[model samples]
Target chain A: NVDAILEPYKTENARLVKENNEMHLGLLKLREEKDRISRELKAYIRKLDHETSDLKFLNNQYVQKVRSLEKDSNGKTERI
Target chain B: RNVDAILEPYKTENARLVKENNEMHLGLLKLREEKDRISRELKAYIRKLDHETSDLKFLNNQYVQKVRSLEKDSNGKTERIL
Candidate 1:
């Protein structure tokens, strides 16, 4: 019978099977690597999100402070 | 029973390996996709080169025909002079 894309996969199924075993042996290593990368990426994302939150906080504070000062200045000038 | 601690670490390792295997399987898939993309680009370049060669041959033939026509005109003028 004709084969598909991995038709060679059938004859070399044995090789793939052997590789599968080896992969299992090294599976722990790959798992550790994946976790390490995930943790690192999460760390950077956390830092970025924190910085963004901080900037928003500061911007809100600035707007409130500016409005308060403008009202005070306007009231003072109007009284004069 | 007293050495169960030693086996506990192996259990963790086994769990980690299972997770890692799943991730690596994904990596292999990404690698295969990249290889296919490069192969497509290489084939496109081969086809382009083949087309260019055909165009060059056409230009060369036109040049040779132009030179022959010029020579024929010169020969006729010389006969009139003689």
Candidate 2:
């Protein structure tokens, strides 16, 4: 008898959780794509794929790589 | 134990159970309303995000090609100069 009222909420909770999971994974995929594009651009500048006339432009491109590399190096240091 | 004298106790117990069940039912209805609202918004976001991801994928591939051509040109210039 109590199960009659209890069942709907439990079932709705499960449905809501499923929706949350999909949204979570959707956001994760979007972030992965952003990171992928950022990585590709960083690689472009590191490879010196094009010549730059301005030092400021060159430095701007390197900033992202510098921070990323620093983070990687620190992560490795931590592991060691 | 089906005694007539014990009927009042059983009726009282049933009343409490009924009220408890109704309480959850009301709360459940409220939650259902919220659940639908949230799910609709998230569905829209996921749709837009997925489409944007596709656009980014296309642009990223083009950018990758751009870098490749630039590198090829750099190589060509170096080779001609040498």
Candidate 3:
């Protein structure tokens, strides 16, 4: 019976160890994809940051162009 | 069976470890909450950056403040060791 997988109960240390080993194996499988998952998460974060910056730049340019167009008017709002 | 003798020495230690386990579980929940908060904050940060607003600063403040609070709670045991 020693060679067979035993039913584990929380109060039983031997069974608990077996359960721990099984859990460890599951974690081991997850480890294989850790790098990939981290890379994907990081890439997504960076993309969001870049998009934010681009939008800021565009808004700034729009505001500046609007200011220039307003400066061309003669002491009042002018017709296009 | 001498169950009392077998379990006597474990009394304090078990309580301490149980509290420790609870702290770890709380920490896990906090980490999960942090991930969710960051996800939402990242989106807002991006949006505010586009709008030329200081939303990242605001979100960053929330993160920094909460981090310190969580870290403080993460340590310090209330166990009465004898």
Cα lDDT tens digits, model 1, A2-50, are 3353344444544445566776555555556555655665565566556
Candidate 3 CAPRI assessment class: incorrect
Candidate 1 residue-wise lDDT at B4? 48
The numbered model that scores best in DockQ is 3
- Top model by lDDT, which number? 1
**Proportion of native contacts present in model 3:** 0.02
User: Tens digit of lDDT per residue, candidate 2, span B1-82?
Assistant: 4343435444554555556555555645555565556556555655665565566556556655655665565555556556
Look at candidate 1 and give me any clashing residue pairs. A27-B17, A28-B17, A31-B20
TM-score of 2: 0.39
RMSD of each: 29.8, 18.0, 24.4
The TM-score that candidate 3 achieves is: 0.37
Regions of model 3 farther than 4 Å from truth:
A1-17, A30-38, A75-80, B1-82
Q: Which candidate is the best by TM-score?
A: 1
Per-residue lDDT tens digits for candidate 1, residues B54-79, read 55556445545654554564555555
Q: Which structure is stronger by DockQ: 1 or 3?
A: 3
Error of 1 at A59 (Å): 67
Error of 1 at A70 (Å): 85
